[PDB]
């Protein structure tokens, strides 16, 4: 049924839709290509939303709220347990 060459991976317990790879050619090990060549030669986790341009998303109020919230306390906790040892200038 599937044009060749192909690879199919199925979860044996149905926990997944199968997924597929179809290529022109299967990989082939090229011993002739020169060293060191291979012989085979977004999303904000905070706001749980995709974006296109980071710069703008960072200024958006959804993000600016989170950025300014109390959420970073778990970071803060780990941090206030380390020992500062650099010189700080005024």
């Amino acid at each position: 049924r599937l044009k060749k060459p192909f690879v199919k991976v199925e979860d044996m317990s149905q926990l997944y839709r199968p997924f597929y790879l179809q290529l022109t050619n299967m990989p082939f090990i090229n011993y002739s290509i020169q060293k060191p060549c291979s012989p085979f030669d977004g999303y904000c986790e905070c706001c749980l939303q995709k974006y296109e341009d980071l710069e703008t998303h960072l200024l958006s109020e959804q993000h600016r709220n989170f950025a300014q919230s109390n959420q970073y306390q778990v970071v803060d906790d780990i941090v206030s347990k380390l020992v500062f040892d650099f010189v700080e200038y005024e």
């Binding site: 690879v7 199925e10 044996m12 060191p36 998303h57 970071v75």
Partner: protein, 318 residues
């Protein structure tokens, strides 16, 4: 150019101005960027410091999770530790002692065979260490393993992608979701990912890091990097089947719940001939390939472990 980046880093985390003379950007990546800086230590000497600026879209648990790995496991056995960390809202910067390091591509075809044993030796120390805490690194590759050839010093870095074993001694790792479920998991490099990861296996153990170490060793033995050049997971798998055999891969994947179909059967390769043809280098002992074979065990249950690897005959007498 980078002048703007640097300037903006000071704009982002005001407190850095007090402490660091930021000299240069040394790396960029999907999830962070790394700068070189100089600071003064209360104890007297001036220190070179790497500043890793995380991407402000990072979840707080992910940030804290990375940081906790560095605090608990880091600072010992060729694992990177942490001096201090600075935040200003969503901008976090981790400070680390700085290790001047080589490009892998560079030293690749110039290391003596002895330096290869030493390199592998030192990478398994690091993985023994993180594995004791139940840390699954998930992005072991040469660029995350800093090597200074002159000083013979080593350092595993980057826990920005880590997960825990179900019994992790690292509390925050338990809040990181696995790719199997779809905080969010972070994608790693296809060419260093083990077949159980490529096939989306819900059970993912520290064995996945051992396979990655195998791939590194394959590159060292064969003189080729990147060994597996693939941009998606299945391409990577198809390349693996070309090396380790499609039958062998199909069988092994049955043991972890995955049914793999492949339309072109390809036999397993002898690892010695493969590496020799792709290339102390006159008398590479059998033990080397034997170890590579155990690292690139298609079965994650039988794959050799970091502490087992350190006892391999390949490593007498060190």
């Amino acid at each position: 150019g980078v002048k703007k980046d640097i300037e903006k880093l000071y704009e982002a985390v005001p407190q850095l101005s007090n402490v660091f003379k930021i000299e240069d950007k040394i790396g960029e990546g999907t999830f962070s960027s790394v700068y070189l800086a100089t600071a003064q230590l209360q104890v007297g000497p001036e220190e070179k410091i790497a500043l890793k600026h995380l991407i402000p879209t990072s979840h707080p648990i992910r940030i804290a999770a990375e940081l906790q790995c560095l605090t608990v496991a880091g600072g010992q056995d060729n694992v990177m530790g942490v001096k201090y960390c600075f935040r200003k809202n969503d901008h976090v910067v981790i400070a680390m002692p700085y290790l001047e390091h080589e490009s892998f591509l560079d030293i690749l075809n110039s290391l003596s065979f002895q330096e290869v044993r030493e390199y592998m030796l030192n990478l398994f120390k690091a993985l023994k260490r993180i594995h004791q805490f139940g840390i699954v690194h998930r992005d072991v590759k040469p660029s995350n393993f800093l090597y200074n050839r002159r000083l013979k010093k080593y350092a595993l870095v980057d826990f920005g992608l880590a997960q825990g074993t179900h019994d992790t001694k690292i509390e925050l790792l338990k809040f990181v979701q696995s790719e199997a479920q779809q905080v969010a998991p972070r994608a790693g490099t296809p060419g260093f990912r083990a077949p159980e990861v490529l096939t989306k296996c819900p059970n993912q153990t520290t064995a996945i890091d051992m396979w990655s170490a195998g791939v590194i060793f394959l590159s060292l033995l064969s003189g080729r990097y990147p060994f597996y050049k693939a941009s998606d997971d299945l391409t990577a798998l198809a390349q693996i089947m070309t090396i380790r055999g499609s039958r062998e891969t199909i069988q092994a994947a049955k043991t972890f719940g995955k049914s793999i179909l492949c339309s072109k059967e390809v036999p397993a390769q002898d690892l010695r001939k493969l590496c020799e043809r792709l290339r102390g280098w006159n008398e590479v002992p059998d033990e080397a390939y034997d170890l590579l074979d155990k690292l690139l065990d298609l079965n994650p249950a039988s794959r050799i472990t970091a502490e087992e690897a350190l006892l391999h005959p390949f490593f007498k007498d060190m």
